Amino acid sequence: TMADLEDNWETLNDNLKVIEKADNAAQVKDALTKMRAAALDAQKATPPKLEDKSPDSPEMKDFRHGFDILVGQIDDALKLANEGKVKEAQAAAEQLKTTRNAYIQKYLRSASSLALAIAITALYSAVCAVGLLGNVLVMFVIVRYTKMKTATNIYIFSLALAGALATSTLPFQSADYLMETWPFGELLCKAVLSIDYYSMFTSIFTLTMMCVDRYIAVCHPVKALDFRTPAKAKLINICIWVLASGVGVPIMVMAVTRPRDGAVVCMLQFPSPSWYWDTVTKICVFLFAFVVPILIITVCYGLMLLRLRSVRLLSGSKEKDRSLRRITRMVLVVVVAFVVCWAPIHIFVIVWTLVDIDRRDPLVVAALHLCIALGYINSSLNPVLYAFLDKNFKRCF
């Protein structure tokens, strides 16, 4: 693989600095031992530059010849370290820098991933600041000014509470990406992962119910005067937040920090066989939090268009019937936004599980974090867009 080529190339370079800052023969000896084994390992690989080239092509033979000269020189420096010389063995490491520069360097050119890391940090910080502070403001205006004495105000609070909880994870997630390690410990790993899965379900199920609530208001306006009561809306939202603990609590139990390659990983420890239960969780999350919500909302839309097609077919007065047609067009808006935001990451999780993906490639990294972020854009933008377009809320803000 190219991971092997990159890591071997890194090992060669890292061990050159080891000799540079070495003081004893024991330090110089093992650095050349590692460098020798990494040079012989790297000459077996095919450079990305020459991936289209035959293993016996003149360019490929030249790449290998560079390592032959390097290994030969490493063995000259090894005999000096074995003889008891540390000045000559360190001086022979300098001629090793000229060799990997004049022969190998041309085939193993590198670039910096700094501009991508900045863009990613920018994406998470923008989606966090708008999302968290925006929904904290929404919640404040409802609690302190537009007092929740209506069914809608209770639903906007639920979407707002969820959206804010969701985006509070983002500072930890982006610090993890930058550091290439989990520095917050197991307790903060449990709090993060549980809040991540939990707020996902509370957000999506409170949004789904909003569309059901709009459906009842539009298609049954007389019966809705009984159902769309604030005490009934209050109960539905509590049931969502209490129901969603069947996801939050198990994720909190399984969320653990484990050591991997000198770095720390925040992950879920699934029961035996862990690979099975991990795949089952990804399937149940895709079905309950994506498929089931799309179906319910699309059915709410289809019924709404039918119930308004009949009033249109009645041909009595479209003077105030069009005021409900704007509500169903908004249901199409909510469903398309939910699909466009959630579909890329849900497809990413399915491909990640079935296919081997180059974790290192900057195209897959850019696309992954954009995918993760869109889900948050939806969870935090649905409450703010609804609230700031609500007539009552607009006056109270």
């Binding site: 994870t169 997630q173 993890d176 990983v265 925040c266 992950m267 990451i345 999780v349 993760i372």
Partner: peptide
Amino acid sequence: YXFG
């Protein structure tokens, strides 16, 4: 949702 995706981490890590």
